[PDB]
Design an enzyme around this catalytic site. Structure first.
Site, short mmCIF file in Angstrom:
data_model
loop_
_atom_site.label_atom_id
_atom_site.label_comp_id
_atom_site.label_asym_id
_atom_site.label_seq_id
_atom_site.Cartn_x
_atom_site.Cartn_y
_atom_site.Cartn_z
N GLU A 11 11.72 24.85 23.32
CA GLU A 11 13.14 25.21 23.17
C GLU A 11 13.89 24.40 22.13
O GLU A 11 14.91 24.85 21.60
CB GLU A 11 13.87 25.11 24.53
N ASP A 20 20.00 31.93 20.09
CA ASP A 20 18.58 31.85 20.42
C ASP A 20 17.77 32.91 19.66
O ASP A 20 18.29 33.57 18.75
CB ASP A 20 18.36 31.93 21.94
#
Ligand SMILES: Fc1c(F)c(F)c(Br)c(F)c1F
Length: 164
Positions: A11, A20
């Site tokens: 991440e 994202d």
């Protein structure tokens, strides 16, 4: 290696609101804020999550706090899901981390379609499970990460991460 280090690799860490892989407003260590295209909506979600008026930036400590909560929420979600709990219970600790990783990324709604993969994993048919997991939107959209998670399910080792 462990679930925290694993997800930290997958991440990253960013202290300002970013989008994202799906284009959704996110912060910290893959903490999804909202699917709304409104930055103001995202900032509101951030403020609510942190408990203060942030205007889009958080500290590393705050990022790690949300991260711990999110990892916890992912585990608790698996254990409350009738389709997921048995498969999770059947796994060793390394493969459990791979499971948490997937739920962290896609949520329970995102993993609803993995019924056949889940069966193969519970059967411990690791190579077949690995092949099946790759036949997914998930693999196609995030192949490098999916490959790491799949290798983890295939081998029950940290080989895909130990070098990172
Ligand atoms: F995608 C997956 C999950 F979300 C999960 F919870 C488990 Br257990 C799995 F085994 C899996 F493959």
């Amino acid at each position: 290696m462990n679930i925290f280090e694993m997800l930290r690799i997958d991440e990253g860490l960013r202290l300002k609101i970013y989008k994202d892989t799906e284009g959704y407003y996110t912060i910290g260590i893959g903490h999804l804020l909202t699917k709304s295209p409104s930055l103001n909506a995202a900032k509101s979600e951030l403020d609510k999550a942190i408990g203060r008026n942030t205007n889009g930036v958080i500290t590393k400590d705050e990022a790690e706090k949300l991260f711990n909560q999110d990892v916890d929420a992912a585990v608790r979600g698996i254990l409350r899901n009738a389709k997921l709990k048995p498969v999770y219970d059947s796994l060793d600790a390394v493969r459990r981390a791979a499971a948490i990783n997937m739920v962290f990324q896609m949520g329970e709604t995102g993993v609803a379609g993995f019924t056949n993969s889940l069966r193969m994993l519970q059967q411990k048919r690791w190579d077949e499970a690995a092949v099946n997991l790759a036949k997914s939107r998930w693999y196609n959209q995030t192949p490098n990460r999916a490959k790491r998670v799949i290798t983890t399910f295939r081998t029950g080792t940290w080989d895909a991460y130990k070098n990172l």
